[PDB]
Design a protein around this ligand. Structure first.
Ligand SMILES: O=C(O)c1ccccc1-c1c2ccc(=O)cc-2oc2cc(O)ccc12
Ligand SMILES: O=C(O)c1ccccc1-c1c2ccc(=O)cc-2oc2cc(O)ccc12
Ligand SMILES: O=C(O)c1ccccc1-c1c2ccc(=O)cc-2oc2cc(O)ccc12
Lengths: 10, 209, 219, 209, 10, 219, 209, 219, 10
């Protein structure tokens, strides 16, 4: 599954 | 959205024209670039399922992405029903398909509160992750520094694509260890290989300035 | 619109200039594209029949469309008078009268009456009723304004599958004034109008495959 | 304008720059198209006579229309004085010519309230109706479908002009019964006459698509 | 006298 | 500006950026057209002498006009000192002093003094007084900036009567800094400057006909 | 800024994006024209030293003017320290260099209040006066009516320059007595000299219309 | 952001669309010019770690710069864990735990925890700490993005002294991410890079002359 | 010293 695009934070 | 009033009470506010126009213009300009997902998450702050459905529905184009998003929402709602077989919310009540605004308000302001808006936004963000990863125009393997391209631009495209692909931090790090240095143009590649192992991004960009 | 003040009381507020201009510009630019109906439903939040009549009146063009809309509103008002008739007679000194089809559309009711109906306990959402009628009329107008038919949407020879799907579900949304369009005939038509190669690929994928898998197969 | 504050009190607020700019730009862009009168009525919500005079006076051009409007306001004020011969408001006090802001506030917030703002807005809207009806560029009799014009456009101009002319509903209906069908181009006119009597607008627009 | 331009409502 | 809070108290508020930019743009675009004075009067609502001085100071151009305006303000301030003099002497411990011509123009008074004068019971509208002086100066400047004379406004040979009336009452408004201009000489001049045909029509219409009837006759 | 809340309390509010963008765009468009100083004074209403430093620092260009302004602030702070040798504020505390936001709030809301924001804005306005006077493009002596220039424009430049130079009212009056009339083109100069002594600006502009 | 309501209570507010769009446009237009850091510091007023992460995440470009920024944040978080470690053990039933380097950066803390830390008495400004780390990273990125060197800034032959000073302190600000740059070497370099005439004038002016006097001498 | 640019007021 994808990991996300929120470089900063969670 | 549900917002706290100066009297300390949690009340319902109508979604703003500023916010609506914001989301519409973001989907128009940025298409499905990764930065679209943070902005969405920021414009839906305090949102009910009805407000999220409003935001998604005002999108004019990208109907393929919106149908995919629908499918993903259905999948997450089915999983929610499996996990979880005043009324209790079902998979359709969190997605605002079978619940009414007053019921959503009830769940969200209840004590203990039932964050239906945050759950639905979670599913929506998942579908959006899938769509963004699918809509990446170029793979990280084909991101190579042009002959007359500045190194800063090459790394900008490198980490933009790397953000769009959405891999674990170990896969991203592993990518920037070797793939970043090898794909550089001959000059900056010789300089980089001359630097040494374990050089920071700052150092690599500095050497090739 | 009826909005709650910090004191916790439901009060009336003048319709905002930002909302007025918003609706006006949406009708100007988007014409009658499907996405105009969601936007409307969002800009008329907590709106009274008066405010709805303001949004509709401020529209300067598409006057024929506004005539169709008025006809639809009259039809729904008559159906309300049939299913929800008001007993001609006295009213209790402390109670308020019942709304007729003309009272919900804000044509025979004063702003204070609409406020009372919307803030009563139990409430009588005349604004939401009238908004549902308006949205029915707008649905009809959108359906009529559909430029092309879903039958005429076919994947180009060297056109990406993604673009073909975009125009497909876009045109279908226009022709049906809705996004829930997962019918067997709709799906079979999607797979059939595709180019021969992606058609063979999709057919080979099997039945019941998700749109995600279908678009992944024809990358 | 007089607006209710969160404490339940009716207070006076200064007319907004957003509203002023709104009305100015509406009169600039739309001239005296019918839609101008609703918008006005919507921007003057809760207005005092002084606020209405502000709105009208900020108009730069169309001084003929504004002088006509002045005359109409005088006529309605004279009729008010005839009907109606703390002070009681006269025809000049409702139009804000001889009353002060604090007096207007007094009348509007009094119990029972005396809506001077709503009366003045009524007279103003009457004058505006007269001006719009006078400024209609073409009569409904001369609205005929061009040879290469879409029927939808022809009906748009037909009912736009019909709205500008401002007749009773019976005269409007009577106009659309015969005049609408007869003025169509030969093709759509033959189709329409082939449809039958008592066909809805939806049906006529559908047949000529 | 004119009838008005308020297509919807009163 | 002095605005009422929800508590019911009259408090001071910083002048808004939207109002500042509004006034600035009005002075930039409209120059000194008559409609600028109403707009000013609306943007300076509830304004203190300080806020008025802010609006006037933020104007970057038309500095000569601003000098004429300053002269006018000094004249009206002197007339205030003549008709409304302040007794040189002691002030009661609980009362506030009386404003001089310099105190109303906000040049010798602090913001707190202006707040006290404007919120006292009975109030002393120093902001409205100063605003009336400013509007006198602006009236003079508008009157001076009038491009053409009413005498030079004549109906073109093939020009519509409506356009001729527009330029007529527009030019007259500029030359008189007012819209109430229903004089016998003004009307006779309107009918006289008209083209021969519409002139004969109007003369035939009779005396005391309304502008509505006059414009209907020369359609 | 420190602003009064509806409860009668003096609270701290964050400087607005509207205000920030306002000041930035004013410095961009108007450079250091005199009108920039009023606008500044109007956008810093209720400002703390930190807010003033924010406003000045967001300026991208004109770094010469900003360094001069720094020097002037240092001079005024030194003079403040000489005059004035809960803590008491020093020259560095008023300029926000050595004080914290909470301390500035304390001084400004204290009873009796210590207006550090107004003092700092005073020093800033002084430095800005010096910068404006130094950046005047042309001297009043070289402001002469062009041969084909309208008199209104000539006086506009005359008093614009006269405002930029910032002299005592006696020097300004003395300038407009003789220098204004002498620098006019031959026509309007003959007319003006024909008018007489002690003619108002209104009269001079009228004669040369 | 944590903002005070009229009741006097510190409450949480959703980040505004105007602030989001503001920051986005600042990063788009100004790139990484020095003035971007003040603007940031002003747009993130009273911001929580979550809101800061929102501002940084909404940035679409300069992803390499965002990687350098993330590295810097990790470094400062590790330094916080070294200088400010949290005792592994129990927490008093009424107290709240201590933040780790991951809790200040909002990556392992919930919004309610950040609200508690920021509103506690004594408060724990996690938003201001994280903002200081972010501003360190941004300082490094600005310093790197400096186009030219201060050594290459020399007064043109027929260039005004004012323009030369503007480019001088502008380039120096970029190369040092600061405006306090009154060093002996900096000043001597300013006077040395000047053209010969203004150089002789400045040298003749004497030591310790103010920039005002220096710019007055070379008018 | 300069006199200021505040034409109106103080
Ligand atoms: O169907 C309902 O929920 C209903 C029941 C009783 C009275 C009105 C409605 C009703 C609505 C009730 C709540 C609401 O938010 C909107 C409603 O809209 C209606 C529209 C109709 O044509 C006809 C009826 C409704
Ligand atoms: O004429 C008045 O109403 C009046 C009477 C006493 C004191 C001041 C005024 C007066 C004003 C009173 C109320 C108000 O709203 C505005 C006023 O303006 C004035 C201007 C003047 O030159 C001179 C006087 C006024
Ligand atoms: O240096 C301080 O003031 C301090 C003292 C104890 C705890 C945190 C801080 C500290 C900050 C205190 C207040 C404030 O507004 C901002 C602070 O930022 C810090 C950043 C650090 O890397 C490391 C420390 C801080």
């Amino acid at each position: 599954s994808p990991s996300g695009v929120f470089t900063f934070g969670a | 959205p549900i917002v706290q009033n100066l009297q300390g009470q949690m009340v319902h506010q109508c979604i703003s024209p500023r916010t609506l126009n914001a989301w519409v213009k973001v989907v128009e300009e940025k298409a499905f670039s990764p930065e679209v997902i943070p902005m969405f998450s920021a414009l839906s702050c305090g949102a009910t399922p009805q407000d999220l459905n409003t935001m998604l529905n005002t999108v004019g184009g990208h109907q393929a992405a919106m149908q995919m998003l629908k499918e993903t929402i259905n999948e997450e709602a089915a999983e929610w029903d499996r996990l979880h077989p005043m009324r209790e919310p079902r998979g359709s009540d969190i997605a605002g398909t079978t619940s009414t605004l007053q019921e959503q308000i009830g769940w969200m302001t209840h004590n203990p509160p039932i964050p239906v808006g945050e759950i639905y936004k979670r599913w929506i963000i998942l579908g959006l992750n899938k769509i963004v990863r699918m809509y990446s125009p170029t793979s990280i393997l084909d991101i190579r520094q042009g002959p007359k391209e500045p190194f800063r631009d090459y790394v900008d495209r490198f980490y933009k694509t790397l953000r769009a692909e959405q891999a674990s931090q170990e896969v991203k790090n592993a990518a920037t260890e070797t793939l970043l240095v090898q794909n550089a143009n001959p000059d900056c590649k010789t300089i980089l290989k001359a630097l040494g192992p374990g050089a920071t991004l700052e150092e690599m960009m500095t050497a090739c300035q």
